[PDB]
Design a protein around this ligand. Structure first.
Ligand SMILES: Nc1ncnc2c1ncn2[C@@H]1O[C@H](CSCC[C@H](N)C(=O)O)[C@@H](O)[C@H]1O
Ligand SMILES: Nc1ncnc2c1ncn2[C@@H]1O[C@H](CSCC[C@H](N)C(=O)O)[C@@H](O)[C@H]1O
Ligand SMILES: [Mg+2]
Ligand SMILES: [Mg+2]
Ligand SMILES: [Mg+2]
Ligand SMILES: [Mg+2]
Ligand SMILES: [Mg+2]
Ligand SMILES: [Mg+2]
Ligand SMILES: [Mg+2]
Ligand SMILES: [Mg+2]
Lengths: 391, 391
């Protein structure tokens, strides 16, 4: 069935936070529809495709957001129904606090068209990077501020809390000059109830232009009642609220997971460097403990272990794998007929050609890496473990 | 002080999910250190810089993950201390479940070097895109599975739940052949306690190669006890657990936010299209209600409103804004001296040159967009509202 809809993001910071694949789909599309919030990103998009439409022109003062979203979605799906490869482009991650992307994709999918959303860099992704926090330690609760209030969503004082749309509390209408955030005090009351007047709240605004610095301003909950401080919270503001305390381990789980030395399970307040610098009353953690120093001393005698798999590929294979990631038309051709595609790629070795003919992950990997004899294959599979994971 | 550390991500899907800015830093760096999980991405990186080191060679069987992380961080910071511009590259978002990035950046920052993490596309970002869910509706709780168990982290049956590292429950050591996930039953017990035996759990694995499809398999909690099903959960598996019910609105908040018609506040089970297709017993929602049809009918008579700001820029300005986003060396030069940089860009109009000299967001925007008279400036500022936001 002719026609496709691919929805992509621009990320938050102008131009640079777009993914390579998002760019390649924008370039390949027959028609591009976009909704972005800075003109440099807009201009950039217009250099990449000749047939773009700005969706922002469908907003209006007093016009219901839902009617705007229905219209934005319909403009995209109308072109899909004509048999065109259509790309929608939205700020950030195009499925994070975005209504028309989900609507348009769901319609396209239900009518039998190819439909896909590509992920992008969200404001929360930026927040993690700029506030130097890992959502994994100690978990992350993420809400829209009005939804948080209206449905009385639970906080955990032991985990990260992230609140979107803190500059738009309770606001229903659209307006081109933004909104008077007159119900912000309702949010502050809730934060006082949950955390206390002296608990920190970090006002976060990611840099939107490449040369700008992020806003990373720590206030007390009580400071948010001051008019001069409240005034700073706008339409691109997010709040990060750090944990008030650390949660203890559960003895039953320690025992069932066989973390057998129970005295040597760390104290709940013990930290792996670095500690969260936004949490109240967190002790300084030593970066170079004797164990760290001993690990560093081992670097002089280091050799890769026997099971390590060196890259052993070719220019031809690297080129084709790159083309498959960066050329949506090549990818579609490959997906339509693995064998015909694989047989038309010049300079591939027999193993490379065979691996591509199959399309199997393991086969492609074994073609591109020297899998050693030492690594006796349990595949007849890997694990990441690059964080403070398990125990 | 000479030297810098920039940590960047590759995203999840091979090559294509790297951001433009991540690529530009990889190309500009004096030394690149990387930890990625597929060889196509590895090969790609090696074509972009002549001085790369694979951090994965510092893992070993039985060697503590913490010693590995200390070593990985130290390898990067050692080069920073020599005055080099160093880039670390990690799978996904480089601050999401990654220890050595945070460690290395914190050390570099405390010793007075330039230090920054650039966000990337995480597994959660992929999950939102592939499962067609918006974390904003009805909020999203995100945990590491072992941490979830050991610290008895709270679930909300009314919000999204995302669990990372479900294939590695309680696992401490590294091993090149992955892990036997023998304590998976401890996770399933907790999920049964919180949600019930018949509640859905979505096993999610994002495509890692461009031609692959994601795994999006719905099981009951009870089905996860079957050995053939449990076996499928591995090191790149994430669980998504949808809400069991919808949460009602709070009358006090409705009243304080002046959502004045109380009878016309939607029923808690009323949905904006599309509904979450993973939730149990969710009714079909009509995409084309009479209100949707009326909105679509208005498209024929549409003209952009008076307050809409058309792009009105130049090739010279678009080129420089693109260069600032995509050339870290140009950006540093610009940041060091706005005026000297701005005065050396040829073909800029006087307004464009002046806007760049200042560096102010508003000034750059007003140089690139026709700000109409109708939009009488409250700036002497915008809001997004592209989702089901406020009310
Ligand atoms: N520059 C910025 N810094 C911090 N938060 C931002 C931001 N831009 C947008 N946001 C957050 O996102 C909300 C807009 S809703 C759109 C979000 C976008 N799709 C994304 O992926 O993030 C804002 O109210 C704010 O909470
Ligand atoms: N292809 C994939 N699909 C779904 N989840 C994945 C994935 N690859 C990694 N993950 C999740 O991430 C964990 C690895 S920890 C590293 C996460 C990475 N920095 C990121 O940004 O996502 C896994 O246990 C799994 O829960
Ligand atoms: Mg989504
Ligand atoms: Mg908190
Ligand atoms: Mg590839
Ligand atoms: Mg592509
Ligand atoms: Mg981070
Ligand atoms: Mg849930
Ligand atoms: Mg720019
Ligand atoms: Mg750049």
């Amino acid at each position: 069935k002719a026609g496709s809809l691919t929805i992509v993001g621009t990320g938050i910071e102008s131009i640079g936070q777009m993914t390579l694949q998002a760019l390649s789909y924008i370039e390949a599309a027959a028609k591009v529809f976009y909704c972005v919030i800075d003109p440099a990103t807009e201009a950039f998009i217009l250099t990449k495709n000749k047939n773009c439409v700005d969706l922002y022109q469908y907003y209006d003062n007093g016009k219901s957001a839902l009617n705007t979203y229905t219209q934005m979605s319909e403009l995209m799906v109308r072109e899909v129904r004509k048999g065109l490869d259509v790309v929608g482009v939205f700020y950030g991650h195009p499925g994070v606090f975005v209504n028309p992307s989900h609507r348009a994709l769901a319609i396209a999918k239900s009518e039998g068209y190819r439909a896909r959303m590509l992920p992008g860099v969200s404001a929360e992704d930026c927040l993690f990077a700029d506030l130097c926090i890992d959502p994994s330690n100690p978990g992350c609760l993420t809400y829209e501020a009005s939804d948080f209030l209206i449905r009385d969503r639970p906080v955990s004082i032991h985990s990260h809390l992230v609140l979107f749309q803190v500059g738009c509390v309770g606001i229903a209408d659209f307006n081109f000059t933004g909104f008077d955030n007159n119900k912000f005090g309702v949010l502050v009351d809730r934060l006082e109830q949950e955390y206390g007047a002296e608990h920190p709240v970090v006002h976060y605004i990611a840099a939107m232009m490449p040369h700008q610095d992020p806003v990373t301003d720590k206030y007390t909950v009580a400071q948010l009642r001051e008019p001069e401080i409240a005034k700073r919270v706008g339409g691109v503001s997010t709040f990060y609220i750090p944990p008030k305390a650390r949660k203890a381990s559960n003895l039953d789980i320690i025992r069932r997971l066989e973390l057998l030395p129970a005295g040597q399970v760390p104290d709940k307040k013990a930290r792996i460097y670095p500690a969260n610098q936004w949490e109240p009353d967190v002790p300084e953690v030593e970066p170079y403990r004797p164990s760290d120093q001993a690990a560093i001393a081992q670097l002089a005698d280091h050799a890769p272990p026997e099971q390590y798999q060196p890259l052993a590929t070719s220019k031809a294979m690297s080129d084709v794998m790159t083309k498959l990631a960066l050329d949506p038309k090549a990818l579609a051709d490959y997906k339509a007929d693995h064998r015909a595609f694989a047989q038309s790629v010049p300079d591939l070795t027999p193993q490379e050609r065979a691996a591509l003919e199959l399309g199997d992950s393991w086969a492609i990997r074994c073609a591109m890496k020297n899998m050693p004899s030492s690594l006796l294959d349990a595949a007849r599979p890997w694990v990441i473990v690059v964080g403070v994971i398990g125990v």
